[PDB]
Short mmCIF file of all heavy atoms in Angstrom, two decimals:
data_model
loop_
_atom_site.label_atom_id
_atom_site.label_comp_id
_atom_site.label_asym_id
_atom_site.label_seq_id
_atom_site.Cartn_x
_atom_site.Cartn_y
_atom_site.Cartn_z
N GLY A 1 -36.07 -68.23 89.33
CA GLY A 1 -37.27 -67.65 89.91
C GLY A 1 -36.95 -66.37 90.66
O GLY A 1 -36.70 -65.31 90.08
N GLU A 2 -36.95 -66.46 91.99
CA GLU A 2 -36.79 -65.28 92.82
C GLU A 2 -35.80 -65.52 93.93
O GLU A 2 -36.09 -65.35 95.12
CB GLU A 2 -38.19 -64.90 93.40
CG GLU A 2 -39.23 -64.19 92.47
CD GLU A 2 -40.03 -63.02 93.06
OE1 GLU A 2 -40.09 -63.03 94.42
OE2 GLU A 2 -40.57 -62.17 92.36
N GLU A 3 -34.58 -65.89 93.55
CA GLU A 3 -33.55 -66.25 94.53
C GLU A 3 -32.76 -65.05 94.98
O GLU A 3 -32.15 -65.04 96.05
CB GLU A 3 -32.62 -67.34 93.91
CG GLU A 3 -31.19 -66.88 93.49
N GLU A 4 -32.73 -64.02 94.14
CA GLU A 4 -32.10 -62.75 94.50
C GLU A 4 -32.50 -62.31 95.89
O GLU A 4 -31.66 -62.15 96.79
CB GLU A 4 -32.48 -61.66 93.46
CG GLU A 4 -31.85 -61.83 92.04
N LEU A 5 -33.79 -62.10 96.09
CA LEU A 5 -34.28 -61.50 97.33
C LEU A 5 -34.28 -62.51 98.46
O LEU A 5 -34.10 -62.17 99.63
CB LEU A 5 -35.70 -60.90 97.13
CG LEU A 5 -35.93 -59.92 95.95
CD1 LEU A 5 -37.22 -59.13 96.17
CD2 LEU A 5 -34.76 -58.95 95.75
N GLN A 6 -34.52 -63.77 98.11
CA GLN A 6 -34.38 -64.86 99.08
C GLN A 6 -33.07 -64.75 99.83
O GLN A 6 -32.98 -65.06 101.02
CB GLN A 6 -34.46 -66.20 98.32
CG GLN A 6 -35.89 -66.64 97.85
CD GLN A 6 -36.81 -67.39 98.83
OE1 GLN A 6 -36.63 -67.31 100.04
NE2 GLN A 6 -37.77 -68.14 98.37
N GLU A 7 -32.04 -64.28 99.14
CA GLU A 7 -30.69 -64.29 99.70
C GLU A 7 -30.39 -63.03 100.48
O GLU A 7 -29.64 -63.04 101.46
CB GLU A 7 -29.65 -64.46 98.54
CG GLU A 7 -29.55 -65.89 97.92
N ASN A 8 -31.02 -61.92 100.09
CA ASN A 8 -30.66 -60.62 100.65
C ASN A 8 -31.04 -60.54 102.11
O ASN A 8 -30.34 -59.95 102.94
CB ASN A 8 -31.34 -59.48 99.85
CG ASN A 8 -30.45 -58.63 98.94
OD1 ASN A 8 -30.61 -57.43 98.79
ND2 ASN A 8 -29.48 -59.22 98.29
N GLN A 9 -32.21 -61.08 102.44
CA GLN A 9 -32.70 -61.05 103.82
C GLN A 9 -31.88 -61.94 104.72
O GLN A 9 -31.72 -61.68 105.92
CB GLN A 9 -34.19 -61.47 103.82
CG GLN A 9 -34.48 -62.99 103.57
CD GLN A 9 -35.51 -63.70 104.46
OE1 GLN A 9 -35.19 -64.61 105.21
NE2 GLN A 9 -36.77 -63.31 104.44
N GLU A 10 -31.30 -62.99 104.13
CA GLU A 10 -30.36 -63.83 104.87
C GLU A 10 -29.07 -63.09 105.13
O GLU A 10 -28.29 -63.43 106.03
CB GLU A 10 -30.07 -65.15 104.11
CG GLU A 10 -28.59 -65.67 104.22
N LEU A 11 -28.79 -62.08 104.31
CA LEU A 11 -27.64 -61.20 104.56
C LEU A 11 -27.90 -60.25 105.71
O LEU A 11 -26.97 -59.82 106.40
CB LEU A 11 -27.27 -60.42 103.27
CG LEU A 11 -25.92 -59.65 103.25
CD1 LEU A 11 -24.70 -60.59 103.17
CD2 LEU A 11 -25.89 -58.66 102.08
N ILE A 12 -29.17 -59.94 105.94
CA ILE A 12 -29.55 -59.17 107.12
C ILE A 12 -29.42 -60.00 108.37
O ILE A 12 -29.17 -59.50 109.48
CB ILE A 12 -31.00 -58.56 106.96
CG1 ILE A 12 -31.21 -57.73 105.65
CG2 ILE A 12 -31.43 -57.67 108.18
CD1 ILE A 12 -32.52 -56.91 105.57
N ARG A 13 -29.54 -61.31 108.21
CA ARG A 13 -29.31 -62.25 109.31
C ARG A 13 -27.86 -62.27 109.71
O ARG A 13 -27.50 -62.42 110.89
CB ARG A 13 -29.79 -63.66 108.86
CG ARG A 13 -31.24 -63.99 109.32
CD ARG A 13 -32.31 -63.31 108.46
NE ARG A 13 -33.54 -63.15 109.29
CZ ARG A 13 -34.40 -64.12 109.59
NH1 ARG A 13 -34.34 -65.33 109.12
NH2 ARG A 13 -35.36 -63.83 110.39
N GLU A 14 -26.98 -62.15 108.72
CA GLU A 14 -25.54 -62.25 108.95
C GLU A 14 -25.00 -60.99 109.59
O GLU A 14 -23.96 -60.98 110.26
CB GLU A 14 -24.81 -62.53 107.61
CG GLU A 14 -25.15 -63.91 106.94
N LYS A 15 -25.69 -59.87 109.35
CA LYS A 15 -25.37 -58.63 110.06
C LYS A 15 -25.23 -58.84 111.55
O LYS A 15 -24.61 -58.05 112.26
CB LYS A 15 -26.46 -57.57 109.76
CG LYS A 15 -26.56 -57.13 108.27
CD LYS A 15 -25.24 -56.68 107.63
CE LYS A 15 -24.51 -57.89 107.04
NZ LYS A 15 -23.28 -57.44 106.38
#
Side-chain angles (χ1 to χ4, degrees), residues 1-2 5-6 8-9 11-13 15:
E2 284 223 338
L5 308 197
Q6 285 275 22
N8 253 217
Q9 73 136 244
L11 192 72
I12 307 190
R13 264 78 206 283
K15 296 308 88 178

